[PDB]
């Protein structure tokens, strides 16, 4: 359980070094700081699907057997007994999920002044950090980059 | 689990060296920096499909047995008892997926000035990096190449 | 599973040496650089097909047995009881796929100037590299060759 | 798995030495370079066919037994009960395919100038390389021979 | 293993020495070069045929038993019950194919000048090489003999 905090720090440290490695050529060697918060999924999760292809249409069903009796007397006594045995398409997936994936990333980046960086330069700083995190709106990641003078 | 972070770093390092090896002849030995973020699938995953070819059409069904009784009296008492046993085509795929594939790549590339590189030169830099990652819109890969003066 | 990265590097380095060996006589000993990205299939995959030839036509069906009773009274009471047992043609393919095949190749080639190479020379440089990769539109391979001055 | 790359290199090396051995007497000892890309099938594959000769025609069917009852009263009650047991011709092929065959060949040949070689001399250079490959349009082989001044 | 490439080289070397041994007396000791490409079948293959001679004709059928009841009343109630048991001719071929046969040969022959050889002399050079390969249009063999000055 204590090794899960060491693991989460290893995940955050690599994303942090990656952001400070792609922004240091732009703003300067020490004019950028990044902090990464990684929510990691440490739950053991097993799953087993079992899908069947629908055979409701006769032009795609696979019959194994079929007994079709059709009687008719003409006062029109009509009978139609039909027994059908099918062979069904079946996919069985079995996934044992990985323990230690990333549920969500929260990244805060501060860049020094030089004078406020133009909206153009800050627009591309956000898009590069967005690629250094592995940003994904599916995970609900959040990124905040502010420009303010250092101390 | 800690070996999965070393493995993901080995994947990113190779994609990164490959981008800096095909762009260094163009922009310069040290006028380009690349950072790769690889989302890897470490989940164990088995799958067993089992498809059957449809035999609803009589011109492609394979009969093993067939008992076709046809009675008829002529007041037209008509019977037609038909039992069919089929041999069915069957494919059975069993895939044990590989643990450690790439789900998604996020690559950020910064190239130095020389003056802003023309839109022609930057368009071919993007398409070369696109081939060095192994870019695939199926995986949802993202690539960001910006042109900004270094420090 | 890190030997799969060493294996994927052997695959890429052989395709790379093959491109720099067929273009070196044309453009020069060091006026070409190639980088290959190979997506390799490391999934264990079994498969067992089982096709049957259709015997719906009587001129190509193989009968093992046949009991054909045909009664007829003449008020025309007609009967026709027909049982048929068939011998069916059957193919059974069992394929154990190879672990380590190539799903897709992404090759990036840069060639030095000398002045921009004519569209004639660049069109044949692409066709040679296309043969050195083993390019196949079935795999969805991508190739990019750009002409730009080196450094 | 790595022995499959050494094997694929052995296949390509032999096709390459054979092309440079049949073109060296023509264009010169060092005025030709060839690169071969072999796609080898390393999948284990078994197959078991089982064909039956059709016996729908009575002039080629082989009867083991036959019970033919024919009743007839004359108001014309007619019966005809016919049971038939057949001996069927059967072929059973069992093929265990070879691991390491060639799926596809990609050969790129460059020949030096001397002045561009005439269309006559280049047409026969293509036909000899076509025979040194083992070229086959069934495998989808591709061959590219360009004439370009060396360096 | 790699022993199949050593075996295929042994097959090609013998066909090659045979071509250069029947053409050396004609064109000269070193005025001819041949390269042979052998596509060999290394698949294990068993086959079991089982043919039956048709006995539909009564003048060539072999009866073991026969019960022929023929009733007749004369209003003409006629019966004819005929049971037949046959002895059938049966051939059973079992072939275990040879591993290492030749599926296809591709031979390229170049002969020196002396002046272009007469179309008469080149027509008989092609027909001799055709006999030194073991040429067979069933296998789809290909032969290319060109006449061009050496170096």
UniProtKB/Swiss-Prot annotation, chains A, B, C, D, E:
Induction: Inhibited in nutrient-poor medium.
Biased composition (Polar residues): 75-86
Coiled-coil segments: none
Location of the protein in the cell: Cell inner membrane; Bacterial flagellum basal body
Domain of life: Bacteria
Function description: The M ring may be actively involved in energy transduction.
Similarity annotation: Belongs to the FliF family.
Subunit structure of this chain's protein: The basal body constitutes a major portion of the flagellar organelle and consists of four rings (L,P,S, and M) mounted on a central rod. The M ring is integral to the inner membrane of the cell and may be connected to the flagellar rod via the S ring. The S (supramembrane ring) lies just distal to the M ring. The L and P rings lie in the outer membrane and the periplasmic space, respectively.
Protein name as annotated: Flagellar M-ring protein
Organism: Salmonella typhimurium (strain LT2 / SGSC1412 / ATCC 700720)
Residues of the full protein shown: 231 to 438 of 560
